[PDB]
Design a protein around this nucleic acid. Sequence first.
DNA 1: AACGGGATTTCTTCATTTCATGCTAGACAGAAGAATTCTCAGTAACTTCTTTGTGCTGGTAACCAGCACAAAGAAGTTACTGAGAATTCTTCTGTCTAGCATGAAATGAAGAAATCCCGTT
DNA 2: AACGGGATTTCTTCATTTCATGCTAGACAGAAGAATTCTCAGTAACTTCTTTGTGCTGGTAACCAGCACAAAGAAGTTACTGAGAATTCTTCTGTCTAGCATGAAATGAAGAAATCCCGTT
Lengths: 78, 79, 90, 90, 100, 97, 89, 83
Amino acid sequence: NIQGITKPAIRRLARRGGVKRISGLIYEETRGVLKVFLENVIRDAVTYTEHAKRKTVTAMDVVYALKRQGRTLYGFGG
Amino acid sequence: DNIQGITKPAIRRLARRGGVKRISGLIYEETRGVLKVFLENVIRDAVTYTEHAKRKTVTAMDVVYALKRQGRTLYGFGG
Amino acid sequence: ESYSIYVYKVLKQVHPDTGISSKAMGIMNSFVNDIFERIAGEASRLAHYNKRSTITSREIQTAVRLLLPGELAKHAVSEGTKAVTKYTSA
Amino acid sequence: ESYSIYVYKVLKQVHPDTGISSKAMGIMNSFVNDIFERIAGEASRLAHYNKRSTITSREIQTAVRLLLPGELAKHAVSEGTKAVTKYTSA
Amino acid sequence: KTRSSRAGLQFPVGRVHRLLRKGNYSERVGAGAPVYLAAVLEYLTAEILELAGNAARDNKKTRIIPRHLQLAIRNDEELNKLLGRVTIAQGGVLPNIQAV
Amino acid sequence: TRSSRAGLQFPVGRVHRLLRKGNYSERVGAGAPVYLAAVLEYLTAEILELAGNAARDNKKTRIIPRHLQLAIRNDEELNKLLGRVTIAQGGVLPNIQ
Amino acid sequence: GWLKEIRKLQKSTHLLIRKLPFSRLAREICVKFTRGVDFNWQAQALLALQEAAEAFLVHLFEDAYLLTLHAGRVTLFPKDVQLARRIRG
Amino acid sequence: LKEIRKLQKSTHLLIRKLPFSRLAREICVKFFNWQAQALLALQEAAEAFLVHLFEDAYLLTLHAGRVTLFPKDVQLARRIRGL
DNA sequence: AACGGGATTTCTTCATTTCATGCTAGACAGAAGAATTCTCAGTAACTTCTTTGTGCTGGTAACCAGCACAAAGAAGTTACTGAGAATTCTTCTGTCTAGCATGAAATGAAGAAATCCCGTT
DNA sequence: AACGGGATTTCTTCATTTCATGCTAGACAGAAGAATTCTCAGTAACTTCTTTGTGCTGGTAACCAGCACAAAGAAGTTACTGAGAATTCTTCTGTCTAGCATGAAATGAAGAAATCCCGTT
């Protein structure tokens, strides 16, 4: 499932940031990382959602959660 | 020029204690450099506080709130 | 509800010949609350350190003073300590 | 008035033999405080987000889950979960 | 008779005031705090839309989209500071590269 | 005391106030300040538990800030929590990469 | 594709990681923190997730590619995208 | 590499006080009276800054292989922290 | 090893909880709205997944070119007290100066489709 | 440059805000005891100094062991597009609870004294 992220995908990213030669393992050092992230981010954003006793996570359910990791996402205020 | 109150031997202690071995040459100014954008940055956010309640006496707590506002909590000074 | 409509009129103020989208509206709208939340906060953290149980126009001032940087700060002051006056005397 | 009368009470509870320097007592209280806040903090905020003016124990619990890491969470919650009932059934 | 046009402001003095008593940031709010604050947000709100609108013109465009707010921010000494850990959506990035 | 019913040691009483006085709300539940008092006690007894083992570990019978600094950086779960903190007079983890 | 494509995407503004493979990905990592349940994800709440996740890998890449160019190289390595994830906190 | 295991084992604030004390009131006078206590807090936090600063910065020196610090480092370091 | 400065302990008056009893409010419990989000089906439409081919990037071992650690015999100037000298936090008082409280009337701001209209196809 | 499907505008309402005054109250400006913050001076005296050298480390090539970008290909995977069901957030309406008030004592606590003792000298 993790292989959901292709090669040029992770690359494009790695490219946007200004990277020339994208090494080997890198491709999995992203599936790896992006995994730690969506984790700490979804577990947070889900606890808030189980508080309001909801079966649907809310846009705001996530944002509040980034706002805990130290990332203030903007464009979504419900 | 009181930015020289910190010295080659002193900067080497912090450098050394930080797991640093063979220090470089200019790291004896770099220090004298950042320590001045830290203290400077921490002073302002901390002076305004003293300047808010009113007085000419900056308490460790005018500071500590400055360090939290900083994103760097400090322990052992409260009340 | 939200600041959207206000974020619009003002937009027209400092820029008439210009428009906006909706996502870029979402951000504005996400911007306002983001600064509100910081100012009223650190101003709330302010009226607290000094036992005062009320937020003055002075709290919000020394509060902005502490949240907005060098040049941004100065102008939010003159738009404030000049918004209290034209509110009081008139 | 500070918690150093309670921090110490717990100190010699777990190591009734050991003492503590008044300088660690500064860390102690500074800490307890830094913790009281962060939890009651994101609780004010949690009762706030889900449109209410009440802070149940239920809040000061999802408030902890969200602040205390790993097993420091799955233990402090059953330390409250346990300390609240024993209260009700006073 | 609006408290906002009385303070010469566009942004709601009224709303903010209330928004200031609910989140319980205190027990009592000045009569000037919720007219000073609301005026600071107007500036900032007009402060970005100022630039973000410009870049829009520099980008040969007369429509504020998320991308324009991105450059308005990342191309201003003050803003970037303020908006440290912020992440604009559909933002994109500054076209900066560097070789060996 | 109320900490008696809850069977704590940390002021269920004090917190309640310190909790309605901070304006964290305008209406405070009755289980809340009781709960927080227990959660505070745990964490505080918690860290001491380590501060004081490594205190007898490091051959010393009195707790100094240094010991608090060690229980911290030596608890996978505590260092995470106490990320943005720094103890007054506490050296560091003797570590040469 | 070097100095030529590493200036097309900066100019771009959209997503880079396909929507659905990611969508699927969130719902699963969602399956853990719930005792093993389903959970509706606001189609809205999903994009948000990514928007940030992206700018997190990008910035986290460039914030590291300055670590590669330090050891005098031009090839990012799993050596770099872990030094910073230890030089941030 | 002698003192390494001497100071790691200690806690005494390395930089003297007085030098520092003026260094502060100076960036202060740019805007009083300082409880002698508060000058420690603006100290303990000060050195605590530098310490974890080189440390975090040396990994930047031991990544390019190097073993000798360089300002080249306390600028890539302070750069990945956003400070 | 040993005694010097920091607790540990025990005592006292003092502020802060606490239980009484209403008094509002706040949570609540199903009944169903109005949402939108899961569900599959089912196609269309790229975008992925190769499989060499190999340019040249990262090494790794050499050499050259210096930069940095090292006591040392000193005296600069940082500690540490001590006693002030007195500048100023802080606590009080008593009365100002003022935001809180309604009870509703009215003006404002959020919403529901519809002609125009700007980047994008 | 020809269009796709968002902004931009009107046009009507349910609320939210502004009103009007009467009040409890947080607040503030004039007194003042005194903790300290600043300092001067000392006898201590630790530290930072200044330096001549050579050791151990960094700066460049050299010559190269493989890695990663470029394709021309092969055909499975992303898009959504609905639409039904419905899986569910969301409201609603006042009983049943539940927590806020206001006090009057009644204790749990902060703050000095003094013996009692750990771990820098």
